[PDB]
């Protein structure tokens, strides 16, 4: 059965997505998500063609079947590419890739993760990323006591991994900075990997190398968003000086950023997003690529169910990576999280399970998404 | 005066542009345009603020001293990061830094190449891109044929270089297009610089190798677009094994990225455009990278009048270059070419005259505008 | 409305020196700058005869412009002072007609020079203050030390965030009676400030130090400046990758030329292109964008008049790629340019030092103090 | 016998001006060498008070010391006044006093002064004649072929080996003519000579020289010279190995430093570091050893005085990577200073200068006319 329809739908909750619904000649659906600002994102989807290079993105798979990934996937990529190419462009690319390994697998009867080349692990253990809920300027000692409870949960599940962030604050000094996270590393303990997300804080790579030189002995697995994102050489020279994994490319768009990443940096860990990069199709490239680089691909992966779905299939596959990042509703309270999708795999001693449903394996909540949308699904 | 408003307005001719207009407090203006999708455009414009690097890119202005280009930049780089950094959101950015020349510019009193360093050459010439009004499925000779009145009325205005181009078509051999450019060089003669838009015809090097071997006789200034936009690689052996200029960055964004094809590829030209890559500010950071490699900046110019005002401004700055590309109503019957604005600046003898105009000199067409926008300017 | 005429100003105080440049348009509206350079040396360099195209007047690439452009300006100081200016001393006098331009096109539109500049772009200014002791020559290390604690003391009164120290050259001392010095400083000093230290060009070879600056690393220097010898990037190169903190360099070199040789050599962490030498305030925008490239950071050097401590607190407001800029305050030191030439120097207000809108550069010059020591009038 | 004084003449004529350095001895011999730049500020340079470590008067490292000691005299010139010199004006001011050094050493021994720059290691010095033609301002292509015309047959005269013709800097002429112009310049000049181009720095797009030089490949040129902006090394570089022939540079550049920066960047096969510019023939003579290593030639710029034709004949009989050094000769240029300055300067004998061995530099002062032009007693 070929492709019918693309539907870009936005979700707004009083927390938004857009999810992407691709429809067959036999009313079978799949379903991604593409990043961006929901109503700004289906109008991108819902322009007019202009010329060779700027067409609508649907136009690229009506008509077509959605095995073909590569040939969906540079088409899209292809006929936008005056609009597309980086950034916003590549977003949309994302959602409707998503949808298509979820739409192929439904067709097929076969989970997705059989479309991405098969298993290759036994189990999928992921790292959860602990994001406190807590007031702005809420101070140090605040946030640690926040973390407290969730730190506690993730040992309870038995999680092997956990992120703690640094939560942007100019009015604290790197010192306090150090200690904070010397504090954190105590409440995690010493049977979990640690890492950090510095959420942008640095500019000067000598001053985030000092830093991480006063944390050598917390051990951390992985230090992320350190610099800003622009700033190749900083990484490079940060890499070079510190004696962990650096990360890099969370907000990249495309297998080339990825690549001179890689190339520039030699940061050991690629970010690139599932439904901010070009998609799937395009993770699969930069995983082949982090491998010659012997780089750990963990895509960055914060938003709903449907992109936690896609995390599952990918992780299963990605063998390369230890860990990739996972959003559990477990750990977060948004909305989304708790009510867009069902029957959430649950957190078994550290891994969860990625069950052969055919294609992702969404268990969309309908009612709620006809509820918020107030159109019919 | 501060700025109080940031206004996109669709323009669409039942041919588009988005014109972004900046207000002041005491209610001056300034035009600038943005590429893309204009409904798209719009909606980017009028999205809701969520977090650190996702904001409204208004609000990075509004309430700002429109003299202070770097810092409003930056401010809007930088609250924008999560959804432009590159690509569509960029071009969001160019239209508004473009605005805010003119802005500045007529608050002051000054016109806008003052306010971009302070003009460096006597007189802007520019080269004209010259693109023919043809059938689709027109032959290679029919083209040449409708190349003919366009040359004459060139060198009627004492041009003294021009552009033409491979309409794509993937029906006619490299053996063909080679005599058809032959052709153009006899009719265009040997007084004017003769430059070739590829419109991205070629994927292996190799194949335009063989092409452009075969016209060294022809004595080509520039070959522009000739390898997929993508390839770096395939550029830099081109670059290499060819005997002028080659050109590329034609549909990127940012600094960053023009910096990347110059340390690459060795292109000689950097095509970054004024309502795409950034706007003015950014330009003017790629023109100095470019004089540190000895290349020329000549931004990608075919919008409006609107961008052939701030072609004009930053073409008479931008010493490095012995030319800029320039649409001329003399040479093209668009819409919006022949009506968005008035009293383009005639060519003379080659030269187009930059005024001392407050601003960049644009002078609206009002009533067309409020004709086709069905609301009031 | 065009600039008419230019004037350098020679200042001697009977060692006590600067050149004062200004510029001057049509309505009798002027913008103050310094040139770096012997003061009437550099008084002949703006006097000289025309000869042919890359040798004229410097003067003569202004007068008749519009002070807005500065791009243009610049690049025809540049020019046509090729054939005797383009590196060095040539320099200093571009730098200098170059700061009076912000000056002045600031004070023709109403508007501090900050905004030229490109805006402002950080909440505050923050600078690191140089203290530099006033001993005789014998003073021993222990006698610039007691020397240093009042310095010292003051800058904590007045909140500083940052602070440099100096080896004054003194080679009847060992390296290894240097780290004791620094050590003893930082004890001084405290770790509730950042240290800098300023070699002043101690060293040759940079395995010697190498050994110093080993030894002083719990003592956690934020920069270590002016280490080896000035034209020895090598050595500049091999020291920064062994050392774990930022090393200067540029502190002597003119031109984004030199400033990116450094960089893509050497990887110095931190960039000491001065205001008054290396080609002005519209150089230094060029540089401080080639720093952001490198992850390095632009810190100009100053240590002149009160005249660039003005232009280094309007380029220190819009250089955002720097957490400190160098200035050198009143408080801590007593010449008498840097005390009399000037009125009403900005405070030390928590570390931070206000940046007016006042229009230009918003300098307060003493004209009676000028015009006593020249001898004319101003 | 030690150092005692230092002076810097002007000598400007009603361009035609030079600096006269005189350095005499205990004895009352003297050394003469001359420095570039501005004569009355050359003056002044040297005239200067202390102030630092790094800023003294430049005579200061020279009196009371052998003139003999030629790396130990650079050096403390170089190091004494590094604050103001390093880079440009300043080290026209050492080299001017350098080559003065290699008269006056040469006078005090009795001996030629390149027996004190390693001795003669060539049989010949064979020059490349620089020709320039009197013409006006608004000259056409055609009026300055037809200036060249008895020049290029007076060099014919002599035997002369090579000549270099210029392109009068002229934006009002398009490539396509200046090829023309040096395709008719080398029918002139005929088969028998290597021919050498001065561009006098009109490209600035190295595309468009390229072009150029392409269409010029069957005139056979021996070097191209000052074709792009002495600054844009990239350009060079990218010129360099897309042409044919010799890329020359370094024309306007200062110490070995910039020198080497050339080299290793751009490739240019001949270098031209300038004896009154660069540091003076110490500096040139290690600068000679850098382009061996790199198979480059010297040819430093000599468009002075009589007194730096000496410097060059003495040079050019010791720099055996060289084929050629420049030259201007009293027969092709009527300047007043390169007639009237010096006496009896050696004729042109098939092509070939003979370089005496008169002690030191050989210079053969006209004192009269330099008493007349000064005012002063010599
Ligand atoms: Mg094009
Ligand atoms: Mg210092
Ligand atoms: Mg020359």
Redesign the interface.
């Known amino acids: 059965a070929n492709i019918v329809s693309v539907e870009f739908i936005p979700v707004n909750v009083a927390e938004?997505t857009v999810i992407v619904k691709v429809t067959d000649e036999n009313g079978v659906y799949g379903l991604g998500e593409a990043?961006?600002?929901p109503?700004?994102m289906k109008?991108?989807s819902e322009?007019?063609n202009?010329h060779?290079?700027?067409n609508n993105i649907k136009e690229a798979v009506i008509g077509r079947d959605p095995l073909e990934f590569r040939a969906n996937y540079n088409r899209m990529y292809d006929t936008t590419?005056?609009?597309?190419?980086?950034?916003?462009?590549?977003?949309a690319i994302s959602g409707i890739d998503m949808a298509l390994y979820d739409l192929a697998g439904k067709q097929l009867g076969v989970p997705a993760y059989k479309l991405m080349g098969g298993a290759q692990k036994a189990q999928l253990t992921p790292y959860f990323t602990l994001y406190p809920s807590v007031a702005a300027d809420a101070t140090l000692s605040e946030i640690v006591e926040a973390y407290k409870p969730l730190i506690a949960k993730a040992k309870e599940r038995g999680a092997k991994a956990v992120k703690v962030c640094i939560i942007?604050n100019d009015k604290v000094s790197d010192k306090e900075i150090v200690a904070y996270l010397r504090e954190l590393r105590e409440v995690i303990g010493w049977d979990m990997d640690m890492m950090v997300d510095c959420?942008?804080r640095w500019?000067?790579?000598?001053?985030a190398?000092?830093t991480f030189?006063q944390l050598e002995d917390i051990d951390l697995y992985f230090i992320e968003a350190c610099?800003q994102?622009?700033?190749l050489?900083?990484h490079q020279?940060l890499a070079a000086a510190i004696n962990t994994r650096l990360c890099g490319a969370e907000?990249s768009?495309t297998r080339?950023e990825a690549q001179?990443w890689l190339e520039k940096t030699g940061i050991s860990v690629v970010q690139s997003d599932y439904n901010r990069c070009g998609g799937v199709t395009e993770l699969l490239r930069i995983m082949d690529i982090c491998e010659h680089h012997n780089a750990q691909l963990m895509p960055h992966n914060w938003k709903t169910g449907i992109t936690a779905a896609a995390a599952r299939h990918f992780g299963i596959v990605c063998h390369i990576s230890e860990y990739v990042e996972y959003l559990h509703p477990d750990f977060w309270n948004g909305t989304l999280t708790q009510q867009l999708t069902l029957n959430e795999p649950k957190i078994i001693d550290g891994a969860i399970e990625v069950s052969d449903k055919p294609g992702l394996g969404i268990e969309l909540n309908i009612e709620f998404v006809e509820q918020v949308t107030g159109h019919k699904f």
């Open positions: 938004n990043d961006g600002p109503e700004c109008a991108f322009i007019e202009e060779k290079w700027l590419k005056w609009i597309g190419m980086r950034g916003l462009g590549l977003f942007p959420l942008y500019t000067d790579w000598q001053k190398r000092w030189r610099l994102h622009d700033d050489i900083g020279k907000m768009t080339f001179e």
